[PDB]
Amino acid sequence: CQDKVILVVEDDYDIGDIIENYLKREGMSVIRAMNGKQAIELHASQPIDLILLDIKLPELNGWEVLNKIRQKAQTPVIMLTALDIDKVMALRIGADDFVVKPFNPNEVIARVQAVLRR
Numbered sequence: 001c002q003d004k005v006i007l008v009v010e011d012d013y014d015i016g017d018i019i020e021n022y023l024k025r026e027g028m029s030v031i032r033a034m035n036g037k038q039a040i041e042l043h044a045s046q047p048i049d050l051i052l053l054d055i056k057l058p059e060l061n062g063w064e065v066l067n068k069i070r071q072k073a074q075t076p077v078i079m080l081t082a083l084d085i086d087k088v089m090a091l092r093i094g095a096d097d098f099v100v101k102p103f104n105p106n107e108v109i110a111r112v113q114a115v116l117r118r
Contacts, residue, residue: 001113002027004049009039009065010080011058019052022105023112036060036068043069050112054080054101063088076115078108 010016033039
């Protein structure tokens with residue numbers, strides 16, 4: 001999975017930093033988006049292999065963020081979620097996946113690598 005590019009969409013800087021270093025130490029490249037507008041822009045401009053998307057974003061509803069991206073490409077997504085909207089989350093299995101908050105960062109690496117392999 002070396003050189004695969006992961007878009008990490010997360011408003012909390014420390015959680016994003018934890019995810020980033022775990023992904024980079026496994027050999028992946030990381031691009032950080034702090035909100036949904038940034039996610040849409042960076043997904044449009046960079047070759048992204050997988051999006052890690054926190055549902056809790058400051059202004060946009062994070063499912064319409066996914067919806068907006070999905071109208072464009074079928075880029076794999078792993079949602080970071082607290083587990084409301086249980087249905088739309090079961091929906092994604094699917095090729096996609098989710099990680100429940102709070103999480104062990106090792107779970108993120110495991111699920112990213114699995115989704116990429118599929």
